[PDB]
From Swiss-Prot, chain B:
It is found in: Mitochondrion. This is Large ribosomal subunit protein bL31m. One of its GO terms (molecular function) is structural constituent of ribosome. One of its GO terms (biological process) is mitochondrial translation. Component of the mitochondrial ribosome (mitoribosome), a dedicated translation machinery responsible for the synthesis of mitochondrial genome-encoded proteins, including at least some of the essential transmembrane subunits of the mitochondrial respiratory chain. The mitoribosomes are attached to the mitochondrial inner membrane and translation products are cotranslationally integrated into the membrane. One of its GO terms (cellular component) is mitochondrial large ribosomal subunit. Belongs to the bacterial ribosomal protein bL31 family. Highly divergent. Keywords: Mitochondrion. The keyword Mitochondrion applies. Signal peptide: none annotated. The keyword Mitochondrion applies. It comes from Neurospora crassa (strain ATCC 24698 / 74-OR23-1A / CBS 708.71 / DSM 1257 / FGSC 987). The chain holds residues 48 to 105 of 219 of the full protein. Component of the mitochondrial large ribosomal subunit (mt-LSU). Mature N.crassa 74S mitochondrial ribosomes consist of a small (37S) and a large (54S) subunit. The 37S small subunit contains a 16S ribosomal RNA (16S mt-rRNA) and 32 different proteins. The 54S large subunit contains a 23S rRNA (23S mt-rRNA) and 42 different proteins. bL31m bridges the mt-LSU central protuberance and the mt-SSU head.
From Swiss-Prot, chain C:
Component of the mitochondrial ribosome (mitoribosome), a dedicated translation machinery responsible for the synthesis of mitochondrial genome-encoded proteins, including at least some of the essential transmembrane subunits of the mitochondrial respiratory chain. The mitoribosomes are attached to the mitochondrial inner membrane and translation products are cotranslationally integrated into the membrane. This is Large ribosomal subunit protein bL27m. It is found in: Mitochondrion. Belongs to the bacterial ribosomal protein bL27 family. It comes from the Eukaryota. The gene is mrp7. Component of the mitochondrial large ribosomal subunit (mt-LSU). Mature N.crassa 74S mitochondrial ribosomes consist of a small (37S) and a large (54S) subunit. The 37S small subunit contains a 16S ribosomal RNA (16S mt-rRNA) and 32 different proteins. The 54S large subunit contains a 23S rRNA (23S mt-rRNA) and 42 different proteins. The chain holds residues 349 to 383 of 447 of the full protein.
Length: 123, 58, 35
RNA sequence: UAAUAAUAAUCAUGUUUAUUACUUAAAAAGCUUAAUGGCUUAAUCUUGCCUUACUGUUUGAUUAACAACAAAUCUUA
RNA sequence: UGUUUGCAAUUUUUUAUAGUAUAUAUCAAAUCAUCUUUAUGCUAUUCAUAGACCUUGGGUACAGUAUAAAAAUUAUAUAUGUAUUAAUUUACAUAUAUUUUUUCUAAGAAAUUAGGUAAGAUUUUGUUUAUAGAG
């Protein structure tokens, strides 16, 4: 009971009748937030257009490569489109071992570790 | 007259998380601990590090 | 506040008086020590 | 760096959990109780404020209610 | 002084001024319970004050990297140690409680409520995919 009463007190401060009220800004305060909200959503637009511009440029570099490759005769006696048809195959792309977990598991960090990189890694 | 509900969110802190590799990053959580040291995580697990021999005991 | 003003006043006012005779009996404790 | 042509993308001045409009067979669920019909653009559901589930009189119909009359049903001022 | 504290930002209305209908201010109502002591307390430091580590207290602090200068201040009954004064006055320190600040035992965890009106929502059933315990 004493431990359960402690839980119920945690749900009491979260009651709709006890949580803090909606903010009340004056004008100069309301306009300062309107200016900060307008610059944040603009910063997000710039980061979006940049983010999406690079993706479109990577995509076009792939297209220009896979368009040339589609019209290449070779190597040797292989006919036109061979390498192109071999590059468009998706064998193993949608399986369990598609992306190595040593690469995906390494998410970014604010500061590096004691050993940032392991040059002594051996096969 | 559809009610306009309000959000009921508990107090959230900013926490520093130190993985087993010594790397650090900041998160947002409800626990008041300022620094969370992690001794066992994905950086020290053989299922996430299949090519790490230090963690391989055979 | 002012209720504690006169208190801190009266207490210290006569506290020094309390030790005016503390000096005295300690003074006669010396000349009485002699001979 | 500019011009021209071609190709691709392009709702977005907006706290992407976007938003908005249109579209998504039939049956079924729900709508006081069987069955039938109907409603999804409301007759269902949710919420707010309410009690017109009011008083008197009254119009036009039910191819002149029930192949008469009466008790009835719908509707107008 | 209700309305967030740096400044004509919602709707309608009252009154006043200018003005010949408009313009500004103002007032009320609607929408919303935002919490408001400018410090009286706390904190740090120093000194008197005993003297082998004590009470009570007097100054100091100068605040945008805001600050000691309010992270939340009420009131009461009993009894006690210290000290007080012409007082169980006062402050201190507790213990026992009772208290306002609604601010700490989840109704936004419960009830199948069926009519009027207004707004909002628009496949809710079944089938099917997956999902600790879980068949
Ligand atoms: Mg962005
Ligand atoms: Mg109904
Ligand atoms: Mg209703
Ligand atoms: Mg007839
Ligand atoms: Mg279903
Ligand atoms: Mg199962």
């Amino acid at each position: 009971d004493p431990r359960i009463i402690n839980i119920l007190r945690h749900f009491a401060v979260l009651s709709p009748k006890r949580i803090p009220p909606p903010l009340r800004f004056g004008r100069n305060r309301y306009l300062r937030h309107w200016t900060i909200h307008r610059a944040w959503l603009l910063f997000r637009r710039q980061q979006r257009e940049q983010r999406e511009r690079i993706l479109m440029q990577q995509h076009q570099s792939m297209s220009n490569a896979c368009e040339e490759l589609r019209n290449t005769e070779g190597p040797g006696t292989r006919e036109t489109g061979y390498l192109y048809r071999v590059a468009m195959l998706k064998n193993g792309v949608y399986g369990l071992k598609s992306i190595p977990i040593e690469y995906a598991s390494r998410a970014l960090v604010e500061t590096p570790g004691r050993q940032a990189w392991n040059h002594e890694w051996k096969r | 007259a559809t009610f306009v509900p309000r959000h009921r969110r508990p107090y959230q802190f900013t926490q520093l998380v130190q993985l087993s590799d010594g790397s650090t990053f900041t998160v947002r959580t409800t626990m008041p601990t300022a620094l969370y040291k992690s001794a066992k995580d994905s950086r020290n697990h053989l299922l996430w590090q299949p090519s790490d021999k230090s963690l391989k005991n055979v | 506040a002012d209720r504690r003003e006169e208190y801190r006043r009266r207490v210290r006012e006569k506290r020094e008086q309390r030790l005016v005779q503390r000096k005295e009996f300690l003074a006669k404790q010396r000349e009485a020590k002699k001979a």
